Amino acid sequence: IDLGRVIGELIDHRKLIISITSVFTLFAILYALLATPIYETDALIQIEQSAPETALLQSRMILGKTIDDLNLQIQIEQKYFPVIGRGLARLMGEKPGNIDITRLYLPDSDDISNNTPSIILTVKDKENYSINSDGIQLNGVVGTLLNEKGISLLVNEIDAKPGDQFVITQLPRLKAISDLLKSFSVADLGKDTGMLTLTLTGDNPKRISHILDSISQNYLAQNIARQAAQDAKSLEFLNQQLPRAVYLQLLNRQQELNIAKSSAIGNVRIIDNAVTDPNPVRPKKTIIIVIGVVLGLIVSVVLVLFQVFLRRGIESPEQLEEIGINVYASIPISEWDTLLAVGNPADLAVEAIRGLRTSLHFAMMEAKNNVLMISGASPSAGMTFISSNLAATIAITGKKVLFIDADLRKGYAHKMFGHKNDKGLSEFLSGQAAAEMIIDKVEGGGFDYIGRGQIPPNPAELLMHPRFEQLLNWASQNYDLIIIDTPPILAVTDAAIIGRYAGTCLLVARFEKNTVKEIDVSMKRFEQSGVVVKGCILNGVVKKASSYYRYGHNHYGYSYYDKK
Amino acid sequence: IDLGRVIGELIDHRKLIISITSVFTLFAILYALLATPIYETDALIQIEQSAPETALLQSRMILGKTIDDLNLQIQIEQKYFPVIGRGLARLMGEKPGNIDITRLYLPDSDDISNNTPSIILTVKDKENYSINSDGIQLNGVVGTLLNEKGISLLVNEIDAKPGDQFVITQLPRLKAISDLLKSFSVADLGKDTGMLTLTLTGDNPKRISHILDSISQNYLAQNIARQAAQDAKSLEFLNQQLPKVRAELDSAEDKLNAYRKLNMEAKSVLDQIVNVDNQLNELTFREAEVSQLYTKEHPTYKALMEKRQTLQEEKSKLNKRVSSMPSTQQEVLRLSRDVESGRAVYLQLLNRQQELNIAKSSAIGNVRIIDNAVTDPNPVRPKKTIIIVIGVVLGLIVSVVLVLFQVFLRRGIESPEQLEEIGINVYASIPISEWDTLLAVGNPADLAVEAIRGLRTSLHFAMMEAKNNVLMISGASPSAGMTFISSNLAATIAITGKKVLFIDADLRKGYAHKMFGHKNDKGLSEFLSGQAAAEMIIDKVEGGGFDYIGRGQIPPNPAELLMHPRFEQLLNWASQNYDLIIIDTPPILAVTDAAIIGRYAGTCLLVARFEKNTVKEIDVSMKRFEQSGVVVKGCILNGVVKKASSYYRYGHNHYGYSYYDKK
Amino acid sequence: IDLGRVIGELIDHRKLIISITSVFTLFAILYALLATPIYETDALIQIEQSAPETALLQSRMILGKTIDDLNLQIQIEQKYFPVIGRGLARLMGEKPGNIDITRLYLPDSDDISNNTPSIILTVKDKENYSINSDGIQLNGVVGTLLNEKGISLLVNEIDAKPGDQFVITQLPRLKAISDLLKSFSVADLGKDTGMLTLTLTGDNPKRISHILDSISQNYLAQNIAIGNVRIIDNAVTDPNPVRPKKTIIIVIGVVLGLIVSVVLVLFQVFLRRGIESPEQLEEIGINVYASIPISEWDTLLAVGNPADLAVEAIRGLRTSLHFAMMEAKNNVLMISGASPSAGMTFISSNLAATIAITGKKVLFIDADLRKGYAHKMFGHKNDKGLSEFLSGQAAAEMIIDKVEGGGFDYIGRGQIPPNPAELLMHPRFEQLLNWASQNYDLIIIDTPPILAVTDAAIIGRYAGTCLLVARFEKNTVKEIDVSMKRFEQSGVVVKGCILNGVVKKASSYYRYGHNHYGYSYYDKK
Numbered sequence A: 001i002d003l004g005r006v007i008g009e010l011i012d013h014r015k016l017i018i019s020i021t022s023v024f025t026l027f028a029i030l031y032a033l034l035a036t037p038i039y040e041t042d043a044l045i046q047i048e049q050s051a052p053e054t055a056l057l058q059s060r061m062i063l064g065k066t067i068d069d070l071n072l073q074i075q076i077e078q079k080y081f082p083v084i085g086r087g088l089a090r091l092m093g094e095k096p097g098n099i100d101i102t103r104l105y106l107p108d109s110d111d112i113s114n115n116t117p118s119i120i121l122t123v124k125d126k127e128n129y130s131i132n133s134d135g136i137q138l139n140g141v142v143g144t145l146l147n148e149k150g151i152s153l154l155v156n157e158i159d160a161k162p163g164d165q166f167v168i169t170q171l172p173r174l175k176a177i178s179d180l181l182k183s184f185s186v187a188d189l190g191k192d193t194g195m196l197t198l199t200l201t202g203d204n205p206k207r208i209s210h211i212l213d214s215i216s217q218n219y220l221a222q223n224i225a226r227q228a229a230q231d232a233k234s235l236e237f238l239n240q241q242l243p244r245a246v247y248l249q250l251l252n253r254q255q256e257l258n259i260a261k262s263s264a265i266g267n268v269r270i271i272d273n274a275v276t277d278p279n280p281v282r283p284k285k286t287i288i289i290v291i292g293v294v295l296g297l298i299v300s301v302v303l304v305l306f307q308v309f310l311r312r313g314i315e316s317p318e319q320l321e322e323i324g325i326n327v328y329a330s331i332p333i334s335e336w337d338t339l340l341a342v343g344n345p346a347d348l349a350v351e352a353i354r355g356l357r358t359s360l361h362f363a364m365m366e367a368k369n370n371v372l373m374i375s376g377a378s379p380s381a382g383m384t385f386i387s388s389n390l391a392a393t394i395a396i397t398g399k400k401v402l403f404i405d406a407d408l409r410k411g412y413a414h415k416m417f418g419h420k421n422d423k424g425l426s427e428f429l430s431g432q433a434a435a436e437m438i439i440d441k442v443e444g445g446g447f448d449y450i451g452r453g454q455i456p457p458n459p460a461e462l463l464m465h466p467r468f469e470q471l472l473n474w475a476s477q478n479y480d481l482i483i484i485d486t487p488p489i490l491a492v493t494d495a496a497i498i499g500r501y502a503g504t505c506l507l508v509a510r511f512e513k514n515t516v517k518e519i520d521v522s523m524k525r526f527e528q529s530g531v532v533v534k535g536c537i538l539n540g541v542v543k544k545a546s547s548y549y550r551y552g553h554n555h556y557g558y559s560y561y562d563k564k
Numbered sequence B: 001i002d003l004g005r006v007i008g009e010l011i012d013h014r015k016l017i018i019s020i021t022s023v024f025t026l027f028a029i030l031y032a033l034l035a036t037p038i039y040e041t042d043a044l045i046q047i048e049q050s051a052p053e054t055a056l057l058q059s060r061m062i063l064g065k066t067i068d069d070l071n072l073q074i075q076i077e078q079k080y081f082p083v084i085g086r087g088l089a090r091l092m093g094e095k096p097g098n099i100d101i102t103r104l105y106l107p108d109s110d111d112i113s114n115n116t117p118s119i120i121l122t123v124k125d126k127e128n129y130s131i132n133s134d135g136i137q138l139n140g141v142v143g144t145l146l147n148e149k150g151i152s153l154l155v156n157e158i159d160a161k162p163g164d165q166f167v168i169t170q171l172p173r174l175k176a177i178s179d180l181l182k183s184f185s186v187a188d189l190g191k192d193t194g195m196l197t198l199t200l201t202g203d204n205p206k207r208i209s210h211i212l213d214s215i216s217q218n219y220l221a222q223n224i225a226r227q228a229a230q231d232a233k234s235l236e237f238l239n240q241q242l243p244k245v246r247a248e249l250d251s252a253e254d255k256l257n258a259y260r261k262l263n264m265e266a267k268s269v270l271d272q273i274v275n276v277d278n279q280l281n282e283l284t285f286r287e288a289e290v291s292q293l294y295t296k297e298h299p300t301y302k303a304l305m306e307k308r309q310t311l312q313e314e315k316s317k318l319n320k321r322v323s324s325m326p327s328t329q330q331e332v333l334r335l336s337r338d339v340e341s342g343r344a345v346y347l348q349l350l351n352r353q354q355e356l357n358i359a360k361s362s363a364i365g366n367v368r369i370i371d372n373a374v375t376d377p378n379p380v381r382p383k384k385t386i387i388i389v390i391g392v393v394l395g396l397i398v399s400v401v402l403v404l405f406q407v408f409l410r411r412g413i414e415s416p417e418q419l420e421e422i423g424i425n426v427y428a429s430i431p432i433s434e435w436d437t438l439l440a441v442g443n444p445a446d447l448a449v450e451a452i453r454g455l456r457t458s459l460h461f462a463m464m465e466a467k468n469n470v471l472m473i474s475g476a477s478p479s480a481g482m483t484f485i486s487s488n489l490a491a492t493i494a495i496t497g498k499k500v501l502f503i504d505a506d507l508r509k510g511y512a513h514k515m516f517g518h519k520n521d522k523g524l525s526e527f528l529s530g531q532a533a534a535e536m537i538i539d540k541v542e543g544g545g546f547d548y549i550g551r552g553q554i555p556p557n558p559a560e561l562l563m564h565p566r567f568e569q570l571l572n573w574a575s576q577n578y579d580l581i582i583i584d585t586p587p588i589l590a591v592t593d594a595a596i597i598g599r600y601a602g603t604c605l606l607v608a609r610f611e612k613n614t615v616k617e618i619d620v621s622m623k624r625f626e627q628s629g630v631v632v633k634g635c636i637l638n639g640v641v642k643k644a645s646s647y648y649r650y651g652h653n654h655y656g657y658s659y660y661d662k663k
Numbered sequence C: 001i002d003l004g005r006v007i008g009e010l011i012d013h014r015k016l017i018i019s020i021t022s023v024f025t026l027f028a029i030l031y032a033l034l035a036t037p038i039y040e041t042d043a044l045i046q047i048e049q050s051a052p053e054t055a056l057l058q059s060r061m062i063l064g065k066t067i068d069d070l071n072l073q074i075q076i077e078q079k080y081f082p083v084i085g086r087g088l089a090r091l092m093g094e095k096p097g098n099i100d101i102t103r104l105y106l107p108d109s110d111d112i113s114n115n116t117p118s119i120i121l122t123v124k125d126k127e128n129y130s131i132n133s134d135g136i137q138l139n140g141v142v143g144t145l146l147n148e149k150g151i152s153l154l155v156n157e158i159d160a161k162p163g164d165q166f167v168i169t170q171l172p173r174l175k176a177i178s179d180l181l182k183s184f185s186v187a188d189l190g191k192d193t194g195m196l197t198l199t200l201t202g203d204n205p206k207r208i209s210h211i212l213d214s215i216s217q218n219y220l221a222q223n224i225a226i227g228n229v230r231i232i233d234n235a236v237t238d239p240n241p242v243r244p245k246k247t248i249i250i251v252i253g254v255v256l257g258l259i260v261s262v263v264l265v266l267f268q269v270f271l272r273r274g275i276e277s278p279e280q281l282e283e284i285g286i287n288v289y290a291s292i293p294i295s296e297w298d299t300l301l302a303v304g305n306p307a308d309l310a311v312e313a314i315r316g317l318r319t320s321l322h323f324a325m326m327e328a329k330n331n332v333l334m335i336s337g338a339s340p341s342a343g344m345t346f347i348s349s350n351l352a353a354t355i356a357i358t359g360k361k362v363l364f365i366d367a368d369l370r371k372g373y374a375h376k377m378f379g380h381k382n383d384k385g386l387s388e389f390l391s392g393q394a395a396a397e398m399i400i401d402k403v404e405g406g407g408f409d410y411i412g413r414g415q416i417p418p419n420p421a422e423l424l425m426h427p428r429f430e431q432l433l434n435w436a437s438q439n440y441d442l443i444i445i446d447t448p449p450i451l452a453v454t455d456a457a458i459i460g461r462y463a464g465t466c467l468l469v470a471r472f473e474k475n476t477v478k479e480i481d482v483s484m485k486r487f488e489q490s491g492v493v494v495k496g497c498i499l500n501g502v503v504k505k506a507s508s509y510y511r512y513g514h515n516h517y518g519y520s521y522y523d524k525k
């Protein structure tokens, strides 16, 4: 493989590549837009150390005091039925409803797993609301507390629109601490300074600044507690030890400890109170979409790289001719029960069949008889398409052509030509029809045809009857050319029986469906039965850039008409 | 090998790959779900260093104090008969039963290996229960202590359902410490700070938090005493009490020497009385440090008063057992008690003195527990995601190496191309017929019969220019399809209006008579041995169209019968009354019968089984025929199956297409 | 070589591989079970440094004080006669007997080498015992000390069963210290802390804890006279032995046994030169007319077991010869080979039996005048064989005899002549063959091997067809090529070869496509 090969493969699979890449980018964009934005607030703490102060800030003693102050064990979440309802509601400009709850006591089920009891609050108006834990409906009003069914709830200042639901969870105190501790981080920012950079992340920009302020003030009040107790403990015992010169001497120590007790701030100073950065830190939309593009491309490339190395079908007539198989024509796919040579004579596929008609006039000379058998390797390779249209292009040249549908198994040529289905080839071979009663004329054609008749139970044994050679010997005197349509050779043996009485035999190879070895196996199965295959007809060729770079030619053909 | 080859091999072995991978993932999922979840509790300790404090926390002095406080030497395990009964019971939502035991003294077998005596407690109801150590059934009730059969047990607050069993083990004090020390870890978390992060893991989430609180508190109590230990009279007391008790102990030791210079019941009560005394003596020192650093109404102090009351009732029942014993034993027991309890009290005072000195050294001042132990409700083990992911990946690499081995190890034929590389003409490739019947008769539209018809037309062109109309069909190995092909080839040539004779010349294992319907008498054997005429051995296949000659009775000399001149006379006679004679023969690599018969056959074809036969096996067969003057025209590949590997390695899988109008 | 080759070799040598691996694993398991378990006790010492304290703990001053306190110079070992008697006694559940000795003074031989005098104490009962140092028997009792023959011994509390012996050694004080110092280790465990982790290993779990307690207390009492050293954890023994590590021993036993089995198989594969398939002979241009398998079944195989797999292969040779022996000068077939015991007499005598049942008159001539035993195999009137005919003292009619369960006549070798190669050169031998070639349809001549003697090259002049028998693995391809060219050099044209003694091998199925053994084909009834 080289540059031209891979570039042709990328050009051919451009629909697959573009679709997979666009799907990946669409998923990345939908995630970047629907993911909940997570903000970050920060505060600065200054200390003379700061390594033991970091572990004390992240302790359940300091953090647990914040959970109690702000009631962080009362989890309230806007109710959205899908996993994307929250993101799209944000895109529609809907402001998220928030309700302020100051007292919440659930019945505390505390079962095997659900240690977090939950209720659902449905806003009815600005003042009153509803509650349903397990179907039990309870009506509540802002202000007046509710103590019913073992459920205590106090909702203040419902700021939402009617109909909105909210999941109200009472998570345990440790779970509230573990959630806060997971989003709360402490750093030093100088590794030597007495400066602590407390950061906190969360989906609510105002709430996380109130939490980080509570953590700072609780750690601040706590810090004074360590030492203001020390200077109070000295003052405590000094006030306990006061018994006159010593009394005045201790009276000086009395005030010296009254003054040092109050000025608690010393070791720890809060340089900046918590403010929230309005730009969310997550999701990082650019890196998500960029990864979506790059991941979509490398996936599209490996899929194309696999389909290229895995495909075995024919890509050009050159592959067949490397083995020594004469390819007499390459018929393109006709994008246009009709005969193509009759419905659209100017079709690009009919122009390729005319090139086969002239190639055969030179190849069918020096043959035993004027009988041409057309077979192939696999079914639906185009044997009936080519033979029936080849017969139509030879009929317009003024020749008497007979098309024999010797596919006694799945032949449908009678349906394609208009049929008096009675008395086909089967009825003749079984002896219940004369040769004159089976020949019929194609209406918009110009050649006669013999249909297959009724499907016999022994198609391969009927073709071995001496009547079949009698029909061909009779028809070879009343027609200039007999074209015999046959089943595929790798399916059944009918074509190897018929090919004994045909002077010329051509195989039809489907463009990408058949393999080169599949066509070589077919030609050698004919030769083993005494049938000499003159050559091959590549059918169903499509325009591909990979063929133009791998080989010099894509073998599709040019359109040549005056446009009017 | 290339991409197409390996991908075709993966497509062909997709059942094996999927099954092995699914088995590995199933085992990984069953482990992740049935493994006992192990939780982790942590605490934070503030140190005013912390490197010597780490080794003191993990010491048997600190940890041993926790084992005594929480009775961690009483191991209780829910009884589950299988190794998975515990995991599945957790999945079924069954809450694990737990029983609270405050006093346990087993008879202490202490045999060669089992230093951990065990009993089995079967819950009968909320109040009473049963006990069976070695079959001895004992009924017990919550509350009232049990002192029977040398087994002391006090079960409080049975929280379980009736029928549940529990294994109650009394493991030694060091084993209880070693188990705790194995799950207990200490870290610094700053490497410079005075912060210690004590972690503890275990299957019980509530228990490990009580243990880590006990480990922290004993430590906290120790350095608080360090401040008050200097001026404490306790030091001077032990400085005086220890020599006194030593003199008393020495006096007891001297007396024991006097009386000395194994009654199963008298000896068993001896250890139990000492065991009660040691706990009572240790409880005395325990009440001292608890009544000072804690309060009386504190639940910890209340337990000791109850536990002391329990032991006093235990000794009281023990004292009555002593008074009921003979004086010959009562003499030695009182003397043995004064020594055993003498040595124990002496040991306690030594540890009391030893522990007291350490507190003074404690360069630490105030000790503060910033954070008390709480359990993380999410188990740390088993890590289900990494277990299942490894189960998938391990299952895939195992499936791949097995497929990679079977590919490099297989030698059988994969396509007719392999035979034709050697110069062997393959006249047909017969697929496996998935459908004592003749396939060409039972299912004429079969894909295998369509391939045999292609052989019929290939033979009509290959059997011309032959010496006679006799066709011998042999092969390399048995069960390669020689009888399947020859009998069905004869059926497809019989429908074409030809007179066919099928001779079953497999005088060893021929069963064609069973396949055609038989008058088993007068087969080929009876003709060759001279006891039958040629006309009496030919029989007609019922649903066939050709005559056949069965093998007859199995002769003792099959290869020597075929050498008789009668066999060539039969073929010369049959070659005039039939258009084709098909001779079924044994395999050539088994016996030589086919090389004898092949002398009189104008055409000889070998049948090669698709994957069972090798290319060299068929080449050896063709050259063994040629060495005996038999020219093998070609080969028939039989039993072909659809394989994606053939489509990528070669261009064609050689299976064939189905061609019928579906109606 | 490739994957199939090595896998076939592993399948063929599976008995050798399995046996060697199982022997290695058995030795590893016996070591892991019979090795004495060695326990480990540890203590914790608090130091107020600790680097100079480590060298003071391991000093002969501190350790020597423990030897004196616990009498560690009195070595007592349970007596077990083998090197495994101790391990197996532990497996049988026998608790090891122990005797407490508080005073021991041996006569202190102190000769050139044995600085450690020893005695043997045999327990008689719970109270009294016996002593024998160099045969001198002395009876002792627990309690009362013994001072006799210059031997002081005081045994207290014999805890054993009668009949048990004990080796009581009085090793020198330095040897007792060196043994303790070897098993005693000190560590810091923090490299900065004042914590010392004293560990001690030994076979006795209770004794090593008493020793480590003595070492701690002696180092403690010595340090006070760094200030107040403290003993945090007194010595306790870990009940799980640290050695032997059974899992790593057995695992190494498996892995070592496998790599040994593989290198032995790898050597036997690269070292073997014998024939492996008839393909090796046919690469040189030698026609192999048959491959006879080993018959696992003085009898004729073609007669005793006609349905044998080897007789079925000889029948294939019979039909291959009917086509190869045509266009020959005469009906005489000479069968020779390269090496002795290659199967020349087995094949020729059985080939004659399979051709005799086809109704032909066959004569089997045993022309091995050196080691021919065909007369023993057919039933013999040993007089008047081929030797007596060639030497002129027998007529051609008096030497032919009939095989009883056979169907062919045979001529035995007769008495072993002193000149076997010179007798066969007599013109009488060609007269016998010319006479027998008119009264028989086939004459089969059994001959000695050509690479041993030249008799077959003399006989092969009068035989129309000559076949060599090659033994399957015993003969080499060059050995058979040397044989065929030694015949051609003497004017004998060898038609082909017969590979004999083939065995079923997976390596042949992977190296070549075929193992050449053959299939069994009978109706099982």
Ligand SMILES: Nc1ncnc2c1ncn2[C@@H]1O[C@H](COP(=O)(O)OP(=O)(O)O)[C@@H](O)[C@H]1O
Binding pocket: A331, A332, A333, A334, A335, A349, A376, A378, A379, A380, A381, A382, A383, A384, A385, A386, A539, A540, A541
């Ligand atoms: N080159 C082609 N262009 C357009 N249509 C084609 C071409 N070849 C085949 N076809 C169509 O695909 C189908 C298969 O053709 P058919 O003659 O039935 O195959 P076969 O006889 O080989 O089994 C037909 O409907 C035919 O119209």
Ligand SMILES: Nc1ncnc2c1ncn2[C@@H]1O[C@H](COP(=O)(O)OP(=O)(O)O)[C@@H](O)[C@H]1O
Binding pocket: B430, B431, B432, B433, B434, B448, B475, B477, B478, B479, B480, B481, B482, B483, B484, B485, B638, B639, B640
């Ligand atoms: N191509 C095939 N498809 C289906 N079945 C087959 C095929 N070939 C053989 N068999 C079956 O496998 C068995 C072996 O056939 P058989 O004639 O007895 O083997 P052989 O004579 O070579 O020893 C038969 O039962 C036959 O029906």
Ligand SMILES: Nc1ncnc2c1ncn2[C@@H]1O[C@H](COP(=O)(O)OP(=O)(O)O)[C@@H](O)[C@H]1O
Binding pocket: C292, C293, C294, C295, C296, C310, C337, C339, C340, C341, C342, C343, C344, C345, C346, C347, C500, C501, C502
């Ligand atoms: N293929 C075989 N199967 C079983 N036994 C055999 C085979 N070949 C030889 N033997 C036995 O091994 C021995 C050697 O045979 P022999 O004729 O004495 O060798 P040679 O004449 O070549 O020196 C004989 O006892 C024979 O029975």
Ligand SMILES: [Mg+2]
Binding pocket: A383, A384, A407, A410, A411, A485, A486, A487
């Ligand atoms: Mg068609």
Ligand SMILES: [Mg+2]
Binding pocket: B482, B483, B506, B509, B510, B584, B585, B586
């Ligand atoms: Mg058969």
Ligand SMILES: [Mg+2]
Binding pocket: C344, C345, C368, C371, C372, C446, C447, C448
């Ligand atoms: Mg011999």
